[PDB]
Design a binder for this molecule. Structure first.
Ligand SMILES: *[C@@H]1O[C@H](CO)[C@@H](O)[C@H](O)[C@H]1NC(C)=O
Ligand SMILES: *[C@@H]1O[C@H](CO)[C@@H](O)[C@H](O)[C@H]1NC(C)=O
Ligand SMILES: *[C@@H]1O[C@H](CO)[C@@H](O)[C@H](O)[C@H]1NC(C)=O
Ligand SMILES: *[C@@H]1O[C@H](CO)[C@@H](O)[C@H](O)[C@H]1NC(C)=O
Ligand SMILES: *[C@@H]1O[C@H](CO)[C@@H](O)[C@H](O)[C@H]1NC(C)=O
Ligand SMILES: *[C@@H]1O[C@H](CO)[C@@H](O)[C@H](O)[C@H]1NC(C)=O
Ligand SMILES: [Ca+2]
Ligand SMILES: [Ca+2]
Ligand SMILES: [Ca+2]
Ligand SMILES: [Ca+2]
Ligand SMILES: [Ca+2]
Lengths: 1245, 191
């Protein structure tokens, strides 16, 4: 705080909350740390002065003048003419682009009490005396302008209020308290005595105790907090009187001990210890290849001289630090840049690990993830989740700052981690990892990048010629490439027409936009890697993009000007909502603390997509400005997020609206789960897992023990939640045998969402829209080859072979509560055999007659012709070869599997021998039994010699596919995303397409498809997908991928799933109000309203007791536009409130304005058409389309038949009742509701 | 009706905004102004920026000709946080668009009753209470606790007449306070 240069009496001496500089000639400059500045002149050079604020000639009008001496008509240019001479990249005097002017509608809220309230010239407002002292009209405009443009946070509010209060207090007029009533106070440290009047220049500790009194030290009072009582206010804080009090050598103030290098040459440590007031000084230095310099913070210190860079290409191609280029393929996780030993002299380990993964064709490896362990902390970055940060197994928000180290932030597309040491890591996904290693380390490094001894040849010599010696961990079968040994290496000749400019041609010597980088970085070695990618995968944009993008990024690192390199036709780039592409932009976008990172920023303009009119929040989502989350013990949490700051699930803290951390006390959860860290979240997770096996078509297995052979032929509810739980996920399982044991049309209902999984032929989950090849959401469905795997968000999984074989694995915390055909979770099958009413039915056929699923057609028959079909009972006694067939396959000498040793095959052997004897043999029954057991072993991966050998059982593939008992079809296939669980930790039977191939829902394409992979699903080429809420088009095209321009459905149609595909089509419910002022009712009818006023139109009038919510629409038929009686506003009286919509203005819920694209009340969607019409929809209810021109259509589903009764009439389909509801004439006047109708009773009286 | 001096009876209260005795509006602080134009105008609301547990209340009054074009209050829409309560002296009471019996409790802690004379009274616990006269005269009563918290046509409860009459507005606050939700468009009707 204090400093006296004494050269011309230059004394910077500051108060409690100021920074005051003083000179001989009365220059009074002070600066509050948060955008508050003051410059005062004592008539110094009154004749003239060059500056932005006046020439001090006593005339305000003459101030607007150029430095040249002429006046300026425009204030922008005039202000920009007074800039400091220097290089100014990305400095705009005004917002050249579209500036987000704040709306005029919400200015009322920002103007009323609670926001810039006392600032208004009101008598009752605090510090009302200052109104006479200073005219606050200019201050009033500033407050509202700042808050309206800003997000509305209270910080700017009281900042402006404090600025006005201090400015008006400097005149010497007393100020009353305002912070408490305004709600914004200061949590000052130490004594924290918030004084309305506090003595300026508070008591400090003079190092030599000999100084003059500053002029500003004698004057008026200042508001603020003082802790000078007790502890003296010294050393920029409040210190006990026996504090450091500076080092007072030459008058300089060095409080406490900062280990500050005295000399500028850094040769002497000289830590000033307050105990002895002496210099603990060492003539040594860091050495080790690093030398001291002036750091940007201001304190000089050691710094590495040179920085070396090792980069890992994308297919892979690895270069060394010394400068050696090599290329290999593999998938086992390896190390990277591992120090051989811990650095003896003040340096830590920095070893990194890299994993590799197979995407697309074989002999191709992509970088899966990179994990860095430094300073005892381990954090990882992976391509599977982009622009997100994972540390020590848990996800955190991106702006993660540790103390002086580990400053992780987001730079363009890349995410960058840097520490105190020179080691820095930059990762962007899609196979590009850049590691900057300082030369300060030793010349010997046991890393995959190689020792940096500056010799390329010695790189990778200890590891041997094979670059796979640096191996650690890894998968059990990583080394074994394929049953055919390490297939399809690309042609070394690389015979492709892909040397042309169109593909892999812009990278090297195309002139055009990429020419300037040729002199900077040699492009030949980058070019060579692009042709191998073109070789392995032919012309697919997904593989082609990473190579050229890596070249562009490596180019931009050195300062260069690059032209427009990517085009919609040639490798277009996608980005989430509220984000636009940028060829090169800000290197450090802002985070919740609205500033760039303290490290060097904006030094390079970086390729990537950035937000607009919103700031990056938590590394994603481009949240609207003014809605940051909360900061808690160094961790940033999104607003509304629920988390446990401590382990053991102690407290569930909530991120409050204005950053408050609202915390309560947790109950440590039920003793069936454990508070564990998995999937990046610490929470109580289930620890037990059971299985329910519906082996075969009719035979079932209880949850525990005895199997209950049931020969029913109808829909039966297998498992469902019987005792409701306040917190859980419900799921109902039903096996709809189509006809007399036909393959079941299985249906699952999880979290109120119906996932089909029904169409077992091929793979066709249908849920609601039958076209679901690969999909995610609440439920993830993965085509495990022939089998289909369904997984929930909570670990519940079920496998269906598609041929009437169900394996459910239920690990959820439903111990006891769950009940049904599988049974309760407990020790005995007897508990499973209990009935809901307790009446045990000895006949197993009677069991399930109560647990019968609906949807049966005209009843169903429960039983064989002769019940139990005893024909097979007698035959097997003389048919000992039938049991000899299956058993010999699964006997111990028969190497069918190793899982039968792990899990006894007795149940499946009994199933095989119990299958219909008349149908028994080596028939479909035997083949299905073997397939079912070998697909049930998939639960735990085991070596499994094929279940089918040669011609014994029949199986084939569409085309170009070979059969393998150990196949991982979940990855290495059509999709660029994976919902696999390691293929559920199983390589299984199925079809593996060869050479250049993809796998689109069974079919194989020679790698010319699957470029369209959206977040939801796999979009085949030349297809389209209309998403929810009439999201019109996400059309896929061969030339360009994912041109997802969205629009809305035209009038007279509703978005509803039809013929297994979701789009908008005409619906039966249609009541149009006044086309030419004529009302067409549900049934065909015509009538003119003939009189202005509000009239009810529809209502689910009582006496029917259906779950359709009470809806009461009204329409204010008013003159409005040219007295044409168009609909002006649509009041909708939902059971939980009133929703009002007007085409011109916004939407009102309960009397409050809301944003147009939002969901309100209970399941009510409100949206505005791009044309301007407004649409409101209710789930399973009415939806209203209000036209821009004033035309309203009411649409009702066909389900409501003669239930609603109103002006539009019933839905019975009879015109005579619909037109007149037992009323002689004019139903409109009868339907005029009196609530909103004006009295107008005897007005002329 | 509020407990005073340890005994429960009804006494005068500080909050008093009478709408149109002779068509003149007396605000919370003493003020006078004629509405001068038919239509619905907002009267009070706990406008945001204060964060007090008083529920969001938004009263409106359809000043309409009605009896001999005397601009008496005809109906009182009250926009409680959980719905709309509409009361008319002649007919019954509507909650969310459904008729209800006069002596009942509805929504959250909202008492509605009909006076033996014929006036209708609605009260909110720790909130506003409105008395709608049989002849068409409305009084809005607010507890003394709400001091300079509500802001509307009746103005603040600070106790200063100059701010209460004009809320930083030169003239005719009524037209400024005309809510557009229930106001008819009437835009270019003669066009
Ligand atoms: C001074 O500079 C301003 C801004 O460039 C220019 O408009 C003006 O004409 C200049 N005047 C003279 C005399 O050069
Ligand atoms: C990297 O350092 C961490 C520090 O604990 C160590 O556990 C890990 O094994 C090291 N990596 C390798 C590949 O040795
Ligand atoms: C399961 O068997 C045990 C052992 O006899 C018995 O105590 C228990 O009651 C049985 N379960 C039920 C639900 O009856
Ligand atoms: C998509 O575009 C046209 C549509 O008929 C066709 O010529 C082309 O072959 C289609 N693409 C594929 C992969 O079939
Ligand atoms: C008026 O009613 C008639 C009935 O035939 C029909 O033309 C239409 O539904 C309405 N509108 C116009 C513009 O005629
Ligand atoms: C009209 O305003 C005046 C204001 O002095 C006063 O008489 C009264 O409040 C209002 N009503 C009548 C009938 O005068
Ligand atoms: Ca001047
Ligand atoms: Ca070397
Ligand atoms: Ca049991
Ligand atoms: Ca009808
Ligand atoms: Ca007032």
């Amino acid at each position: 705080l204090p400093v006296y240069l004494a050269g011309g009496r230059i004394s910077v001496i500051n108060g409690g909350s100021k920074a005051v500089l003083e000179t001989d000639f009365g220059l009074q400059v002070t600066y509050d740390w948060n955008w508050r500045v003051d410059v005062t002149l004592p008539s110094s050079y009154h004749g003239a002065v060059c500056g932005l604020c006046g020439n001090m000639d006593k005339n305000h009008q003459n101030d607007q003048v150029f430095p040249n001496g002429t006046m300026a008509p425009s204030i922008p240019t005039w202000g920009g003419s007074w800039q400091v001479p220097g290089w100014d990249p990305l400095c705009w005097h005004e917002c050249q682009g579209s500036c987000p002017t704040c709306p005029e509608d919400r200015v009322e809220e920002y103007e009323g009490p609670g926001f810039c309230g006392p600032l208004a010239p009101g008598t009752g407002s605090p510090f009302t005396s200052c109104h006479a002292h200073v005219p606050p009209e200019s201050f009033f405009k500033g407050c509202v302008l700042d808050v309206c443009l800003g997000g509305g946070s209270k910080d700017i509010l009281c900042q402006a209020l404090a600025a006005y209060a201090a400015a008006c207090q400097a005149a010497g007029i007393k100020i009353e308290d305002w912070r408490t009533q305004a709600g914004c106070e200061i949590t000052c440290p130490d004594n924290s005595h918030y004084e309305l009047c506090g003595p300026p220049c508070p008591a400090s500790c003079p190092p030599p105790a000999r100084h003059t009194a500053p002029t500003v030290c004698d004057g008026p009072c200042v508001e603020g907090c003082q802790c000078d009582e007790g502890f003296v206010l010294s050393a920029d804080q409040c210190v006990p009187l026996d504090g450091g009090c500076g080092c007072w050598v030459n008058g300089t103030y060095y409080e406490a001990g900062t280990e500050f290098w005295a000399d500028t040459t850094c040769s002497k440590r000289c830590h000033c210890g307050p105990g002895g007031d002496s210099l603990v000084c060492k003539p040594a230095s860091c050495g080790l290849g690093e030398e001291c310099a002036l750091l940007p913070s201001g304190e000089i210190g050691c710094q590495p001289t040179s920085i070396t860079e090792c980069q890992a290409w994308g297919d892979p191609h690895y270069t060394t630090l010394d400068g050696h280029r090599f290329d290999f393929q593999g998938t086992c996780e390896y190390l990277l840049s591992a120090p051989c030993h811990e650095p003896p002299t003040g340096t830590e380990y920095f070893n990194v690990t890299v994993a590799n993964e197979h995407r697309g064709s074989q002999a191709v490896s992509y970088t899966r993830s990179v994990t860095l362990q430094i300073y005892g902390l381990s954090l990882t970055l992976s391509a599977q989740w982009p622009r997100k940060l994972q540390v020590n197994g848990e996800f955190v928000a991106l702006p993660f700052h540790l103390d002086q180290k580990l400053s992780v932030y987001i730079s363009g597309a890349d995410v960058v981690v840097n520490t105190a040491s020179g080691v820095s890591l930059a990762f962007d996904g899609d196979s590009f990892v850049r590691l900057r290693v300082p030369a300060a380390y030793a010349g010997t490094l046991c890393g995959l990048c190689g020792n940096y001894n500056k010799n390329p040849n010695d790189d990778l010599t200890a590891v041997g010629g094979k670059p796979e010696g640096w191996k650690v961990g890894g998968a059990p079968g990583c080394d074994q490439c394929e049953p055919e040994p390490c297939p399809k290496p690309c042609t070394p000749e690389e015979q492709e027409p892909f040397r042309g400019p169109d593909a892999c041609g812009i990278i090297t010597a195309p002139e055009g936009p990429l020419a300037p980088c040729h002199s900077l970085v040699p492009p030949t070695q980058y070019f060579e890697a692009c042709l191998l990618d073109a070789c392995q995968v032919q012309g697919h944009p997904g593989g082609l993009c990473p190579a050229i993008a890596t070249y562009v990024a490596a180019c931009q690192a050195a300062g260069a000007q690059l032209g427009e390199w990517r085009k919609p036709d040639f490798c277009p780039l996608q980005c989430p909502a509220h984000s636009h592409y940028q060829l090169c932009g800000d290197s450090c976008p802002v985070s919740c603390p609205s500033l760039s990172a303290p490290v060097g920023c904006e030094t390079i303009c970086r390729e990537g997509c950035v937000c607009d009119a919103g700031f990056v929040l938590s590394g994603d989502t481009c949240v609207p400005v003014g809605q940051c989350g909360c900061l808690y013990q160094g961790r940033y949490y999104v607003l509304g997020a629920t988390f446990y700051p401590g382990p053991e699930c102690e407290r569930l803290c909530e991120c409050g609206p204005d950053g408050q951390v609202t915390c309560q006390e947790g109950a440590d959860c039920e003793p069936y789960e454990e508070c564990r860290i998995e999937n990046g979240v610490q929470a109580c997770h289930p620890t037990g897992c059971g299985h329910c096996l519906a082996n075969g078509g009719l035979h079932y297995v209880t949850l525990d023990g005895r199997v209950y052979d049931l020969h029913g032929s109808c829909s039966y509810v297998l498992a469902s939640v019987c005792h409701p739980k306040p917190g859980d996920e419900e799921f109902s399982i039903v096996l709809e045998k189509n006809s007399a044991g036909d393959p079941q049309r299985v249906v699952v209902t999880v979290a109120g969402q119906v996932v089909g999984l029904a169409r077992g032929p091929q793979v066709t989950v249908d849920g609601e829209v039958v076209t679901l090849p690969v999909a995610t959401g609440h439920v993830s469905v993965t085509a495990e080859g022939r089998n289909i795997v369904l997984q929930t968000n909570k670990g519940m999984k079920v496998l269906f072979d598609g041929d009437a074989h169900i394996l459910m694995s239920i690990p959820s915390s439903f111990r006891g509560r769950l009940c049904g055909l599988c049974g309760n979770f407990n020790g005995n099958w007897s508990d499973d055999f209990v009935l809901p009413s307790g009446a045990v039915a000895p006949n197993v056929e009677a069991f399930g007659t109560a647990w019968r699923a609906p949807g049966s057609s005209l009843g169903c028959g429960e039983g064989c012709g002769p019940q139990g079909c005893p024909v097979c009972l007698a035959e097997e006694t003389q048919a000992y070869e039938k049991n000899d067939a299956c058993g010999k396959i699964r006997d111990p000498h028969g190497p069918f599997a190793a899982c039968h040793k792990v899990l006894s095959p007795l149940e499946y052997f009994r199933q095989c021998v119990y299958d219909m004897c008349a149908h028994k043999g080596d028939k479909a029954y035997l083949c299905r039994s073997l397939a079912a057991y070998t697909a049930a072993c998939q639960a735990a991966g085991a070596a499994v010699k094929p279940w089918r050998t040669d011609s014994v059982c029949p199986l084939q593939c569409p085309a170009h596919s070979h059969y393998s008992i150990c196949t991982r079809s979940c990855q290495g296939s059509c999709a660029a995303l994976s919902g696999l669980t390691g293929c559920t930790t199983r390589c299984f039977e199925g079809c593996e397409c060869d050479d250049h191939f993809l796998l689109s829902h069974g079919v194989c394409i020679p790698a010319q498809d699957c470029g369209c992979v959206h977040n939801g699903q796999y979009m085949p080429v030349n297809s389209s997908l209309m998403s929810s809420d009439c999201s019109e088009r996400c059309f896929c095209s061969p030339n360009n991928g994912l041109t997802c321009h969205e629009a809305g459905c035209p009038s007279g149609h509703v978005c509803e799933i039809q013929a297994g595909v979701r789009e908008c089509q005409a619906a039966r419910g249609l009541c149009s109000i006044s086309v030419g002022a004529n009302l067409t009712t549900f049934d065909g009818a015509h009538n003119a309203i003939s009189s202005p006023g509000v009239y009810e139109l529809s209502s689910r009038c009582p006496g029917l007791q259906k779950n359709v919510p009470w809806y009461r629409v009204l329409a204010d038929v008013q003159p409005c536009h040219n007295n044409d009686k168009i609909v002006s506003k649509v009041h909708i009286f939902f059971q939980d409130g009133l929703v009002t919509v007007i085409p011109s203005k916004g939407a009102w819920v309960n009397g409050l304005r809301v944003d147009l694209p939002a969901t309100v009340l209970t399941s009510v969607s409100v949206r505005r058409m791009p044309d301007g019409s407004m649409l409101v929809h209710q789930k399973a209810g009415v939806t209203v389309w209000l036209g821009k021109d004033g035309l309203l259509d009411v649409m009702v589903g066909d389900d409501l038949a003669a239930m609603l009764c109103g002006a539009c009439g019933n839905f019975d389909g009879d015109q005579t009742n619909d037109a007149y509801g037992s009323q002689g004439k004019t139903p409109i006047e009868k339907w005029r509701a009196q609530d909103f109708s004006p009295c107008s009773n005897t007005r002329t009286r």
